[PDB]
Symmetry: D3
């Protein structure tokens, strides 16, 4: 068993339920490490499909990045082995389909985490936001790339530049979501689709998933461009605005951004 | 003339109509060779726009891959010079617009074929499925790439992982189709658009179509990533699951997939 | 002060209004040079969001390329330093969000210009046309790429191959627009969103916009493929049809295109 | 047979000898067209290796570009379908090895031509120069790339920026040549190697040559970078220096370049 | 201990000596499994440099790919999981320098194996041959790429198209070898350089080795290019010539290749 | 005038001579800023070729990075806007040839700096070392790439992993240098080559230099690969070994590296 997730297996379908309500499923390292161990434990031939969910009735799916752990003092908080970076890679490389089954509000990092999964099925009352511009966080290239494969550029720029929540109905209309259903039908609807997928050829599913992963990633640039972007990101991590954004969040006041 | 298609010219518009209804327009080599010969014959200055259709009233637009013609195992079923791979390249490189005018159900390789065309106009009763996971087929990279330029990744993954049919209305909503019209209006609506395009500058249409083709292919990877994918595909077409999927289709029974 | 635009700033938002209505805000060099000088003058820390608009009541937002300035005698009219090519680079590199606020009809180069901006908010009565196939112009690779990040390939090919106008409602459905509002709400809706964005962290917005720009351009090809495309574009600008297309537009008649 | 080349077949080896000594085997269209026809006619299973040579005793192997064929009004003489661009593609795509067997002096485009070939075996008295900076020519990307696969960057820059001739001995030392032999041994040495190659597996040789060709071309860039370089090339073709360079060559006088 | 290698440790340097003299150290699956197990066992902080060697006095360093383990026809002979493909990836990714210390003749896959290593130091009597065109084998893109990072294209094509051995002196001159020494001095010359490297910063060496590996592999192409190459390779491994090459090796006779 | 360089012009040739001998021309910010200002000031049409040199008789050409300019620990000394990273970009983008004329010993970042220049002409007594593995520095991707365009991979790895000096004669043999001259002839040999280059077409030289620069950069990878390398570099900067290497150099003792 796991301290911060609960796993149920129903024939070939596994359901990983978040059990980190004390921090509204914020992406703390101890929570992500249990999620990753639970997924790893389910990498077996007789499991064919995974569902990720918050507990039934939750008002919050996930509060996103744990801002108490998101480091300040000049260190990159979205480095390659930071937990959100590790779990998006693991979801994308996992040789079985991973369905995000969403009840409640989805924030920032948690939005990138469900976007990295294969299908999203949501309650009609679920809401979605992408929040780095609230804190002054320079989100990393891979993280931003994970948000560009479903809705168009103008829609993605609206979500990130405003940090405003969208409804499940709008998330469906712009192509983020697969299905929107009444919260009382959410579990039944998602399990029926997961059981259906689990009757199909798992080795064909795994290789087509991996072919889509590498095509998704196949936007290539030279070393100079990457080093230029990393220089820009470091200037943001070094800014007064980044300190102000983190402090304003921890102090629950409105930040005063000044552009240095 | 052609054994397996019928061609009509109306001013500058050519309509290539399938004539393989006894096999529900499955993509047998003999059918695809005729479709490619008809297209090549229509590469003339006086032809400005192509329409591909099934006969009026067809229940099945195309049953997709001829499963009899797939090599039984140990052999890549979607090699570069296999007929579906040849026709999709030919459609994409053809210097005139090609409009798929769809009445009936569209399956598997035939869904890839229409996705490779420039515009899709469909009857309100048409249905669309992508079926390789029903048989355990390791669909090839170029083939999967051809399904990713219209609908988002989560939608494409639902289509491929479930192999379930979608309606014309849902295909329109997610960005696969240009237009949905009542079946009685399908021929007139599509001919009106083709005659319209036929008065525009053909050399500008041809170079813009080619620019889009190159940009659409310009997802690049290193040799190791490609060879790693090919090794994964070979493990699938070497698998007992692939033989069981082919056999269950030919024997009209439900396959039992086990993951090797 | 500018001859061809008017700028109003309130707090952190700047509105750049076209003042070239006597030529339907055609993208003449004198107008684009003024737009670029006004943007450069607004690249200051206290400015956080830009709106581009035509005057209230405009029937035509922009007529697109000035056909009286398009090179005739064997010269590429969309070379790297042509004014449309310069303004789209400047908008995409600009470290503040740029919102296109659209009232009236949008044509050709002007459609590319608004697509290059970060968000589009349009009146319910606005219309959008992409017109190079009306003139026989071989649109350049960068320009075509700018049109492919919002709507899918089939939709983009319909817009370009037909040159037919689409409504704001359809432009919203296919993913081109962020929002459609009644024209009497257009300024208030856009100002509210622009002022909302200006309260967010500008250095995070700037680096995320630049990350999106780099990822969007990261469709790479070898020198041979680019030189092949250049040769195709040159044969179009050397074409009888290209001369006929320009001549027809000047003589206010319908072109007769013949395919050389 | 051919006006401008002579072909001798010895067992499985074909020797293509230039017959344009009147014009020092300058790369005139009529000469290159005959060279490409003779090569095409030798694409038969019983031919296994090609040797390209000047006649025995030639002082000049090839004088490079024909000045009398560069079409002024700025028009790019290194466009995709100009004769030298066509013959380098054809040599690189030719499914048999092509050995350049060099006696005499090699100039400019003829240096690019022999670099495009598979092996170079040269007389101890042969000499090599790359000459576009003598004329003010903006050599094209693919043409420059063809010069970068043998010697290192500093060496290539010395050859191009000086336009000075190098000895066979230096060309061997820096990795441009395979072998340097006394002129009396040049046919024996070259034919012994060609005959040896002709006993090897031709389908393996062809696919490995094509693998090397694609790996050699696999330096990829985005559309913006290509268009930028094209703009710089156009600026050189529009320059006063380019006119001066061509006029000085025609008037047999030293050019005076001024940097515009 | 290992059945097919012997390992010595001298301070911080490990020497892996082949013990498969009965097949002249041909790269059989069981030999490569022990070489890889010995490398994995040595991946410890107190080991800082590896030497690969054949036993003292060896006439044959390695006879290369085990021809008996190649498939009969119709199957890719150089698939991603093939032993040669596994060992070259493991050498390249190994976080310590691997020096090939060469006494005797080096053939085919064994030449690719030493080329994949970091440094090559060779006896003055050693020789080097690349032999797939002797057997009609379609070498893979990754394998060919591993041969292109030291000598120029003209030299590499000579080596592969001739399958002729070159001396240690010529291999030094063209950039393949670091050093050539008399055989009596080979062991202690190599150990002196490995001990010197072992005093340097191992984490710096590892990240620089990895940066060079990524840069070396960063020649990118699109899916269609790779699948076109793979189809050409399949025509070769399906050919009569491939069968003839395998049979000629088994019957110890000269192959008769015909080009199908 | 400049505090840290001396500039002499001889008609079209400019010679930038280091004036930082009391610190062995270490690459301190104040010294690089003066070199960059002196280059910027020579970017004039009447200047056609630059020579970089140390004063006549210098024992040390440049000692490389100023180790007394390491920033606050946990921080990258090879970030995009560090002076060495700035001047190598500026040399590579400079629209005139830059020749490194080397007398004395060349170390570390100074080796990268001369490698980034267009030609290197050296005294027979000059020596060359690449030194980051002496200190435990994770040299950055762009910096390593700048070392890979002249000599082959095996040679570069020997230089980097040994940090051992090589002679001028060995640097010529492996392709690093253009020419080696007796020290009394060095200045005149280098000036005659610079005057010769200055007679050639400057716009042709500039565009070919720029085309070589972008081809040399055109090794592309995806975001995940770049971020994975940055994670490894950061782990090296965070290591005990990195502290030990910098402290050892400051204290003039042998470092004790332990591999964490
Ligand atoms: C990637 C990224 C992010 O993900 O940024 C973080 C985005 N997240 C957010 O803005 C949401 C932050 N949380 C909230 O606004 C509220 O907690 C919401 C979700 C509306 C729920 O309000 P609520 O009144 O029901 O509950 P709270 O009392 O606020 O929260 C319940 C508990 O979870 C803690 N918590 C909630 N969100 C957290 C977060 N993101 N990080 C750390 N702790 C969090 C909170 O401190 C409290 O703990 P404690 O008892 O120790 O004080 N980014 O920056 O780009
Ligand atoms: O109108 P609007 O929605 O554009 O305004 P916003 O301020 O962007 O967002 C409206 C509110 O929803 C909050 N919010 C952000 N992400 C959210 C999400 N995923 N679900 C629900 N609420 C969210 C946001 O923090 C703000 O909180 P609060 O009013 O407590 O400050
Ligand atoms: C991507 C991919 C594919 O393209 O795979 C194949 C996907 N297609 C399918 O699964 C649909 C296969 N066909 C069917 O399911 C049924 O024929 C459907 C479409 C429901 C219609 O049924 P129906 O009762 O009306 O008609 P049928 O008798 O089944 O079919 C009419 C005739 O066409 C033949 N046929 C149908 N589908 C075929 C196929 N895919 N390949 C070869 N022959 C086929 C069938 O054997 C019959 O011939 P015969 O009379 O000689 O036996 N893939 O799997 O890799
Ligand atoms: O229910 P559902 O629609 O969600 O999902 P499925 O069971 O996958 O699909 C429902 C039925 O539609 C069939 N089908 C697959 N592709 C199809 C297409 N393009 N058009 C029509 N039917 C299709 C599928 O084979 C199945 O038939 P059958 O029940 O005989 O096996
Ligand atoms: O083609 C390039 C971009 N695409 C365009 O179609 C541009 C113009 N397209 C149009 O459809 C119409 O001009 C639109 C924009 C709807 C305007 O229609 P309208 O009913 O308001 O009036 P028009 O008669 O079309 O236009 C009024 C005048 O402005 C001129 N004009 C319009 N667009 C122009 C352009 N892009 N470049 C140069 N002149 C233009 C037009 O030639 C006419 O000529 P003249 O100066 O001799 O009077
Ligand atoms: O003398 P150098 O070797 O230093 O350099 P350059 O001046 O460029 O070259 C010396 C002379 O050899 C000529 N030359 C150039 N390439 C040549 C080649 N491949 N073979 C023989 N001579 C050549 C060059 O045109 C110049 O002509 P001319 O004497 O009429 O001026
Ligand atoms: O690509 C594959 C690369 N390999 C090659 O092309 C080289 C293969 N072999 C040769 O060139 C010669 O065997 C070399 C290595 C020079 C050694 O010549 P040799 O005359 O001393 O010894 P051989 O007797 O030829 O070889 C000793 C034994 O090892 C066998 N052998 C040699 N190379 C082999 C290989 N690459 N794979 C499998 N078996 C091999 C050979 O068939 C013989 O078997 P048997 O005892 O059953 O007859
Ligand atoms: O590390 C980056 C690569 N640089 C090096 O390897 C260090 C350069 N120095 C040496 O290697 C040798 O000392 C060489 C270059 C041959 C210089 O000859 P040398 O031995 O006679 O001169 P040094 O003894 O090193 O001493 C000359 C002075 O310049 C200092 N110095 C040398 N290299 C330096 C560097 N890269 N950064 C800062 N200071 C340096 C050195 O510490 C000494 O300072 P101080 O007076 O505070 O002790
Ligand atoms: K011909
Ligand atoms: Ni893309
Ligand atoms: Ni079994
Ligand atoms: Ni390269």
């Amino acid at each position: 068993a796991y301290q911060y997730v609960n796993v149920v297996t129903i024939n070939k379908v596994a359901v990983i339920e978040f059990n980190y309500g004390r921090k509204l499923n914020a992406l703390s390292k101890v929570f992500i490490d249990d999620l990753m161990q639970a997924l790893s434990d389910l990498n077996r031939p007789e499991i064919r499909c995974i569902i990720l969910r918050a507990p039934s009735g939750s008002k919050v799916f996930s509060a996103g990045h744990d801002i108490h752990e998101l480091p300040s003092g000049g260190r990159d908080p979205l480095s390659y082995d930071d937990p959100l970076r590790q779990i998006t890679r693991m979801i994308q490389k996992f040789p079985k389909p991973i369905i995000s089954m969403v009840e409640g509000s989805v924030w920032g990092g948690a939005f990138e985490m469900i976007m990295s999964s294969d299908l999203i099925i949501a309650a009609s009352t679920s809401t979605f936001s992408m929040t780095p511009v609230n804190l002054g966080v320079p989100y990393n290239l891979v993280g931003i790339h994970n948000l560009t494969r479903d809705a168009g550029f103008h829609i993605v720029k609206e979500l990130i530049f405003t940090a405003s929540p969208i409804t499940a109905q709008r998330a469906l209309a712009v192509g983020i979501l697969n299905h929107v259903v009444e919260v009382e039908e959410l579990e039944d609807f998602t399990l029926q689709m997961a059981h259906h997928i689990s009757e199909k050829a798992p080795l064909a599913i795994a290789v087509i998933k991996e072919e889509l992963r590498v095509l998704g990633e196949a936007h290539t640039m030279n070393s100079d461009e990457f080093e230029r972007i990393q220089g820009m990101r470091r200037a943001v991590y070094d800014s007064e605005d980044y300190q102000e954004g983190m402090n304003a969040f921890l102090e629950k006041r409105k930040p005063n951004f000044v552009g240095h």
